[PDB]
Structure formats: C-alpha cells, structure tokens
Amino acid sequence: QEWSSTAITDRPTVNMLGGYYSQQQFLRNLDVRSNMASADQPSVMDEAYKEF
Amino acid sequence: QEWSSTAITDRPTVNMLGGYYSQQQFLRNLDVRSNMASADQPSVMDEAYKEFVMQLASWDTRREFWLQTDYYKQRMVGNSKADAALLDEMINNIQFIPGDFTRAVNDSVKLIAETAPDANNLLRQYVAFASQRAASHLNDELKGAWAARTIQMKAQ
C-alpha cells in the first residue's frame, strides 16, 4: 500500500523547555564569569532543537 | 471558477504592538543588565513579524483556519474521505511566497476560492487569524521569559 505522512518542525519555545531552560541559563552565567564563554553563542532553544 | 486574491505584508508599527512592545523592551533591559546578550539583536517588531510570517506559512495554521471558516463547512458531504480530500485541497489553495530584500520584494500570501467576494473575505480572515495566533504565541513567550527572569532574580 505504501502510505506516507509528513511533519515539519522548528525550534522549541521557552515555555515548553520546562525548568530546563532556567537551569541551563544558570550554568551559562557561571560560564561567563569564568572563561567568559562566548558572547555570541546559540540560544538554549537552538541547542535543544539541534539535539532534537 | 478558481478566483484568486493577494496580500502583501510587512513588519508592524510600534503603535500596533499595544503594551506588548514595552513589556518586551523591559525584559530586554534586564538581559542587558545581567547575562550580556544584546549583540545588536533584531527589534521587537522584527521578532513579532518573524512569528507572524511563521504562522502565515504554517500548514497547521491553514488547516485550522479552514476547519472553522464556514466556507469549508458548507462544502461537506458527510463522507470522511471526501471531506479530508477537500480540506487538503483548500489547504493547498493558500500559498505563501517569501520575499528577499535584495530586489525589494516583500512577503506575499495568495488565497484561492470559488468566488471573488469569497477570495477577498477569506484572505482577510486568514491574515487576521494568523496575526491572532502569532500574538497569542508571543504572549506565551513573554510569560515564559518573565517567569524565568523572576526565578533568576529571586535566586540572586
């Protein structure tokens, strides 16, 4: 029969990142006081969508 | 008959963002005061228009607009397969053409109906529907960011 279905996705939002977003943000602060991290880095939702 | 109507949109003005603009600006202020993230980011109007454009071209937005449009409901024979096929066809009727600033062409949306008054009214209603969905999504995003900022400030 070979039926097919399609889905199209995009980056998540802060609302459905649960607490995770906040936690990650906390760590990012600890990463900019020390080693300065990167001023221009992808957002938390960008990394989450990359992993997805 | 297959009549067609066209609309061309652009970023909203500051006055039509209501209070939302100001609220968003406030949050941005905090993101500049702590956890440097400005990086000459696009304005609030740019983000609002990006969300609106995302909603306009969305397949789900067209499906949900047609499912409640009172123009699809009239053309329902009661058969599930035929109704699904008609819904798919009318979803494909709405087309979004993104614009690129190189040749000064803006984003456009074209709708196809069976009559000219229908082609006009349905396109107006669909643009309003997409704008309302984008506004609701932006409000939810503002709530989430505000809650996260409040939690961070309480911890600090």
Add this chain to the structure above:
Amino acid sequence: VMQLASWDTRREFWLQTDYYKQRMVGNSKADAALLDEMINNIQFIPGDFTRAVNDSVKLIAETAPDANNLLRQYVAFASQRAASHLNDELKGAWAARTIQMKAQVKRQEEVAKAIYDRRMNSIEQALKIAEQHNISRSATDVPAEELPDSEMFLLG
C-alpha cells in the same frame, strides 16, 4: 520608498483623484477593472547603488499634462503618507520611553525610601542601646556620622 511601491498607496491615490472619478461609468465591475488597470500604470523601479542608479517611479496617463501633474501629486501623496507613518512611529516610541522612565524613577524612589528606613531603624536602635548603657560621652570615635549601621552606637 515603501509607500511609493505600495499597492495600497496607488489604490487610494487613484481613488482620490478626479482623473479616475471622471472616467467612472457607474458600473461596479467596470469601475473596479479601471481602478486595477490604473494601479498598474504606476511602476516603481528600485535603484542599485552598485551601478550608481537611483530609485525611479513612472506614471502613465492619457495626456502629457495629466502624466506630469498626476505623478507630482502621487509623489506628494506618498511623501505625506510616509511622514504620517513616521510621526506615528515617533509618538509610539516616545510613549514607550516615557513609560520606561517613569518606572525607573519609581524604582529609584522606592530604593531610596528603603535605604532611608533602614538608616532610621539603625539610628533608633543605636540610640536605645546607648541610653541603656548610659553612653552619654557624645564622642567615642574620630570619624564622622558616615559610620556603618552596626557601629552607630559609638556616639553619645
């Protein structure tokens, strides 16, 4: 430029001109077709800075004086619309700025009041402690009143 190239601007301009009004025949379909035909009679060609060519606008009418006067009036119309939109944007941004400044001033007043109340309480407690221990020497340290709240007891 956005007003110049806008379809809506051309539509309203043609609607408000006597050139279109005198050519109306009273039939809605014919009038709409004529309006659509004359909207396309105004063509905007964006410029290219690489080739040192500027933006241009061309208007087509039925007579040379008409083609001149209508183009002048349309450029004035687009400029007026752009000025009105810019004024609206400026007013909106001004309102946002004054709201933000009012909030900031309120926060500064609240912070100052909190500090003043804390210093009030510290002074009162230091006075009570000094009266309890009969420290009436009026002098115990060389520095001025700019002592920490915990060290304010070193005064009579």
Add this chain to the structure above:
Amino acid sequence: RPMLQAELENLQAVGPAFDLDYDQNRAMLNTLNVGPTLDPRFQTYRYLRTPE
C-alpha cells in the same frame, strides 16, 4: 567589656548589612512580581497590499 557588649547588642539589633545592589535587586524583583500585562489582539503585521 562595656564597649564590646554595646557593640554586640547593636549588631544583634541592626542585623545584616546590605548594599545598594541588594536594594536595587529588591525593587526590580518587586516590579517583576506584579507580572506581565498580557493584552491579546495586538497586530503583528502591517498591510502593504490589502486583499481586494
């Protein structure tokens, strides 16, 4: 003994010492606790060509 006892009592009464940053953060938290004002039905676009 008298001066030390008076200092002990004064420090006990006054409590911990806070700086200007703490008060500013407290005021900002007070403004954050009222919550955002979510107004729906605000427009996210403008028409360059209205449907006809």
